[PDB]
Short mmCIF file of C-alpha atoms and ligand atoms in Angstrom, two decimals:
data_model
loop_
_atom_site.label_atom_id
_atom_site.label_comp_id
_atom_site.label_asym_id
_atom_site.label_seq_id
_atom_site.Cartn_x
_atom_site.Cartn_y
_atom_site.Cartn_z
CA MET J 89 19.05 6.50 -8.10
CA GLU J 90 19.72 3.63 -5.57
CA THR J 91 17.96 0.58 -4.05
CA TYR J 92 18.43 0.26 -0.36
CA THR J 93 17.20 -3.19 1.54
CA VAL J 94 16.08 -3.27 4.93
CA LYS J 95 15.62 -6.67 6.43
CA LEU J 96 12.51 -7.51 8.03
CA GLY J 97 13.96 -9.52 11.05
CA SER J 98 17.45 -9.19 11.83
CA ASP J 99 19.94 -11.84 10.85
CA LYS J 100 20.29 -12.41 14.71
CA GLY J 101 16.46 -12.74 15.07
CA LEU J 102 15.52 -9.70 16.37
CA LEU J 103 12.09 -8.14 15.79
CA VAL J 104 13.80 -5.24 14.38
CA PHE J 105 14.06 -3.78 10.86
CA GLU J 106 17.57 -3.97 9.63
CA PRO J 107 18.95 -1.35 9.09
CA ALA J 108 16.36 0.45 11.46
CA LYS J 109 17.28 4.16 10.07
CA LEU J 110 18.08 4.90 6.79
CA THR J 111 18.58 8.23 4.58
CA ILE J 112 17.63 8.03 1.04
CA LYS J 113 16.90 10.84 -2.19
CA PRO J 114 13.66 11.17 -3.48
CA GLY J 115 13.31 8.78 -6.18
CA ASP J 116 15.21 5.77 -4.23
CA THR J 117 13.80 2.70 -3.76
CA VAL J 118 13.94 0.73 -0.09
CA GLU J 119 13.34 -2.95 -0.61
CA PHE J 120 11.96 -4.60 2.44
CA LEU J 121 12.85 -8.29 2.64
CA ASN J 122 11.44 -10.95 4.83
CA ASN J 123 14.15 -12.50 6.63
CA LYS J 124 13.45 -13.81 10.24
CA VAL J 125 11.02 -14.11 12.69
CA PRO J 126 7.58 -13.53 10.77
CA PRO J 127 5.05 -12.10 10.36
CA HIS J 128 6.00 -8.40 9.29
CA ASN J 129 4.74 -6.11 7.40
CA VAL J 130 5.69 -2.50 6.54
CA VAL J 131 2.96 0.43 7.37
CA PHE J 132 3.88 3.87 7.35
CA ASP J 133 2.44 6.58 9.94
CA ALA J 134 -0.40 8.58 8.47
CA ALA J 135 1.06 11.63 10.58
CA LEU J 136 4.51 11.21 11.00
CA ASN J 137 5.66 12.05 7.45
CA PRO J 138 6.69 15.32 6.34
CA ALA J 139 3.46 16.34 4.81
CA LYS J 140 1.22 14.70 7.65
CA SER J 141 -0.60 12.89 4.47
CA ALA J 142 -2.47 9.89 5.07
CA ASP J 143 -1.92 9.48 1.41
CA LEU J 144 1.46 9.50 1.03
CA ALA J 145 1.94 7.08 3.83
CA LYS J 146 -0.78 4.78 2.08
CA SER J 147 1.10 4.95 -1.12
CA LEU J 148 4.40 3.86 0.43
CA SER J 149 3.16 1.08 2.69
CA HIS J 150 2.77 -2.65 2.25
CA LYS J 151 -0.08 -3.39 4.71
CA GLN J 152 0.03 -7.20 3.58
CA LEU J 153 1.89 -9.44 5.87
CA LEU J 154 4.87 -11.16 3.77
CA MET J 155 3.76 -14.74 3.97
CA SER J 156 6.37 -16.32 1.94
CA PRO J 157 10.12 -17.04 3.21
CA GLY J 158 12.47 -13.99 1.44
CA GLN J 159 9.29 -12.45 0.14
CA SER J 160 10.37 -8.80 -1.00
CA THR J 161 8.54 -5.76 -1.49
CA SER J 162 9.56 -2.37 -2.33
CA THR J 163 8.73 1.29 -2.00
CA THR J 164 9.79 3.53 -4.73
CA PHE J 165 10.10 7.18 -3.13
CA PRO J 166 8.13 9.57 -5.56
CA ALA J 167 10.27 12.20 -7.18
CA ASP J 168 8.53 14.96 -5.49
CA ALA J 169 9.02 13.00 -1.90
CA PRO J 170 9.05 15.60 0.56
CA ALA J 171 12.33 16.29 2.43
CA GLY J 172 12.26 14.78 6.13
CA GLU J 173 11.32 11.96 8.49
CA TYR J 174 8.90 8.93 7.36
CA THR J 175 8.18 6.92 10.50
CA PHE J 176 7.34 3.09 9.60
CA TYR J 177 6.56 0.23 11.73
CA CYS J 178 5.29 -3.44 11.55
CA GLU J 179 1.69 -4.02 12.91
CA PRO J 180 2.25 -7.30 14.66
CA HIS J 181 5.74 -6.24 16.23
CA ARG J 182 5.20 -2.53 16.73
CA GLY J 183 4.83 -2.98 20.30
CA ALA J 184 8.31 -5.19 20.34
CA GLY J 185 9.92 -2.24 18.94
CA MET J 186 9.94 -2.87 15.02
CA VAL J 187 9.51 0.61 14.19
CA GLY J 188 11.90 2.15 11.49
CA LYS J 189 12.69 5.65 10.30
CA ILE J 190 13.74 6.81 6.48
CA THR J 191 14.76 10.45 5.96
CA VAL J 192 14.41 11.70 2.87
CA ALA J 193 16.98 14.25 2.03
CA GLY J 194 18.91 15.91 -1.21
CU1 CU C 66 7.64 -7.65 12.33
#
């Protein structure tokens, strides 16, 4: 089981997730770390995950904006997380491009 870190706001101050795509296994953890240019959150899309399950997406999301410097949240993917793409975005910055994608694979 592995932990992968995704910066919220790149080191260069861009409104992106750094990195914006990652491939992981079920059971792995993605740590989302408040980095630059607040405020950010992490909302998984309800339809764009392999089960098209709003409940799966809710379970992986952190809807609350991260309001402290270097605040961390993490999503440990279920053991039974289905293979495929999981689209997520930052709500405030969605229209600025702050969108990401996790692929779950074996
Ligand atoms: Cu953001």
